[PDB]
């Protein structure tokens, strides 16, 4: 407690934090980092990115290319730094979302006369929702105008971008010295540590070779040679490629770096005893002929029609909460067979181990999720496994890929490869909290077949949408509500949070249009969804606290079937039913308040609901996106 000793404490704290920062900066880019990787996204159409990249290219270049795309290595010892540029087109939703989830600094190129473009807006909302590693804006046509329109064009840019990107300066690119300034900029930049990527180990694919087992098998050894950017990739673990499912690999080896900072041997084998294997599901499989019983007891455009009927049902289930018109011919206790009423929706119990389908025999339920996650992340952090470290230019010989993967890479599509943590390939019940972007106003029903990006995956699925409360019973939603945040639920592979939740929908022929976006809640089948049904009525005889209501049933013993379930009333009154009277649907009901003639007596019925089993892993190849 003095002038000197507390300044000394300030000195110790500065030493601690600067040591932490110089620990985390040198190990990303350079003589330990793999390279520093920059992805390039223009937005408009007027950007001639060959002119951009040829201003940007120069140091020493090392020019790779692909069939269509053209990524390359860049090296300068002057800054002692490795860049790896990779160019992309917006709208190419598959390619951009597959290699900006493993990119490490995103460079947005912009036209001078306006900000985003609509295809770029689409990709921009996608990249916002799956996590920006680091953005850095740029423009190209500013030198072509003298000072007047130059300054005013920059002001129009900073006004047209600060409604989306609230604070950033526009580093212009006209000269190759502007490229030098841009590279000096992108060397020293605070990397937002994306929390999903660091908890695993992921390779990019710099080169792909293929050796088939037999060529008619169309299965064979894949050869991914690239760097390692995550944790220490262990060899007993599995591997996933983001476009073509998950599959277990055979050989890791470390050939030399083809491109150093300045100018067949393997370290590990498989052994299958410890190597976890591909068990995607549970691997275990004198009355008279005349008289009655009475005296005997004394003894193209159909799609638009479907759309307009969906808008009708969103009106009839959004003007109204969950109103259901009553059946008339079938006995109304049979069609509502497995329904039971709760007195209070929050409080009254409901056994979570009661009515499990034949498909709940094919899931892995965690007992304690949070501590198992802490144990797995604790083994990730403070341990060292026997596999190769970060930065190691390694090749993986993967045993069991098909050939069309190799052909899609020879097109120019990027492959990635991230390993799995223990219990990440098995299927269970996934719960995603999610909201709706105001880009699409299309109705999205309950069991719509959609496409998910839940944490570096790509799969068609069929959810059930829910209220998002931290209680036991959660209500089923019957449409995607345009402004609340809901919970979708799907049979799917299990994935440890955090993870971004993209959802898009086929408009027509591969036009994946974005609808929903969010993050990954607790994954467990115990969260049971409760589907509600409101049965309506009308109080056509009104006495003091007792009323006769019709149009809610049509038999008599239906009321004898739904007898203990309490009514409720839009004016707040909480009564419950007495005897029925009619042979048609009619009943007397006790109440607490007096009943208005402008009333709608209505009861509630509940069941447990659960999603359908669709985990078709393949996703159809998207087309370039355009405006509606």
């Amino acid at each position: 407690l003095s002038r000197v000793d507390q300044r000394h404490r300030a000195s110790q704290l500065r030493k601690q934090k600067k040591e932490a920062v110089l620990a985390e900066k040198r190990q990303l880019g350079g003589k330990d980092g793999p390279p520093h990787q920059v992805l390039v996204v223009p937005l408009h159409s007027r950007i001639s990115l060959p002119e951009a990249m040829q201003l940007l290219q120069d140091g020493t270049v090392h020019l790779n290319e692909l069939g269509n795309t053209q990524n390359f290595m860049l090296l300068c010892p002057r800054l002692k730094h490795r860049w790896f540029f990779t160019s992309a087109r917006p709208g190419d939703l598959h390619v951009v979302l597959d290699m900006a989830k493993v990119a490490d600094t995103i460079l947005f190129l912009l036209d001078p006369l306006e900000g985003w473009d609509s295809t770029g807006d689409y990709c921009l909302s996608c990249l916002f929702a799956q996590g920006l590693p680091t953005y850095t804006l740029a423009v190209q046509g500013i030198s072509g105008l003298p000072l007047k329109k130059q300054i005013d064009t920059r002001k129009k840019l900073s006004k047209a971008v600060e409604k989306r990107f609230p604070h950033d300066k526009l580093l212009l690119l006209d000269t190759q010295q502007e490229a030098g300034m841009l590279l000096r900029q992108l060397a020293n930049q605070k990397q937002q540590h994306l929390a999903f990527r660091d908890r695993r180990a992921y390779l990019f694919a710099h080169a792909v070779d293929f050796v088939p087992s037999e060529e008619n098998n169309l299965v064979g050894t894949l050869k991914i040679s690239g760097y390692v950017r995550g944790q220490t990739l262990n060899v007993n673990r599995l591997l996933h490629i983001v476009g073509y499912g998950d599959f277990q690999m055979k050989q890791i080896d470390a050939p030399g770096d083809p491109f150093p900072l300045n100018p067949k041997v393997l370290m590990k084998a498989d052994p299958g005893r410890q190597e976890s294997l591909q068990a995607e599901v549970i691997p275990d499989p004198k009355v008279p002929k005349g008289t009655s019983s009475y005296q005997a007891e004394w003894i193209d455009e159909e799609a638009e029609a479907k759309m307009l009927e969906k808008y009708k049902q969103e009106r009839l289930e959004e003007m109204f909460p969950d109103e259901v018109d009553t059946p008339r011919d079938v006995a109304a206790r049979i069609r509502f067979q497995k329904y039971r009423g709760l007195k209070s929706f929050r409080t009254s119990p409901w056994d979570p181990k009661e009515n499990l389908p034949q498909d709940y025999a094919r899931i892995f339920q965690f007992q304690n999720f949070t501590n198992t996650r802490k144990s797995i992340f604790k083994e990730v952090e403070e341990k060292e496994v026997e596999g190769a470290e970060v930065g190691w230019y390694v090749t993986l010989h993967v045993s069991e890929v098909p050939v069309s993967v190799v052909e899609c890479f020879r097109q120019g599509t990027p492959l990635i490869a991230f390993s799995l943590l223990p219990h990440e390939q098995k299927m269970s019940v996934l719960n995603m909290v999610v909201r709706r972007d105001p880009g699409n106003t299309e109705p999205v029903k309950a069991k719509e077949e959609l496409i998910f990006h839940c944490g570096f995956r790509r799969f068609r699925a069929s959810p059930l949408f829910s209220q998002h409360t931290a209680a036991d019973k959660h209500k089923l939603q019957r449409f995607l509500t345009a402004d609340m945040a809901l919970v979708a639920t799907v049979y799917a592979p299990i994935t440890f949070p955090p993870a971004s939740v993209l959802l898009f929908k086929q408009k027509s022929n591969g036009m994946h249009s974005l609808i929903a976006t969010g993050h990954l809640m607790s994954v467990d089948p115990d969260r049971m969804v409760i589907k509600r049904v409101v049965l309506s009525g009308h109080p056509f005889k009104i006495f003091t606290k007792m009323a006769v209501v019709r149009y809610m049933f049509f038999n008599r013993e239906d009321v004898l079937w739904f007898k203990p379930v309490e009514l409720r009333t839009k004016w707040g009154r909480r009564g419950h039913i007495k005897e029925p009277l009619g042979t048609h649907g009619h009943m007397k009901c006790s109440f607490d308040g007096k009943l208005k003639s402008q009333d709608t007596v209505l009861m509630n019925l509940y069941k447990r609901v659960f999603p359908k089993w669709t985990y078709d892993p393949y996703v159809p190849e998207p087309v370039p996106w355009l405006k509606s």
Binding site: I282, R340, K353, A361, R362, F364, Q365, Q367, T372, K563
Partner: peptide
């Protein structure tokens, strides 16, 4: 036989007990 039934607890998923 009106608003109640059996529905006992039988067959669950693979619980990875922490």
């Amino acid at each position: 036989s009106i608003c109640s039934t059996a529905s006992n607890l039988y067959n669950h998923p693979q619980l990875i007990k922490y």
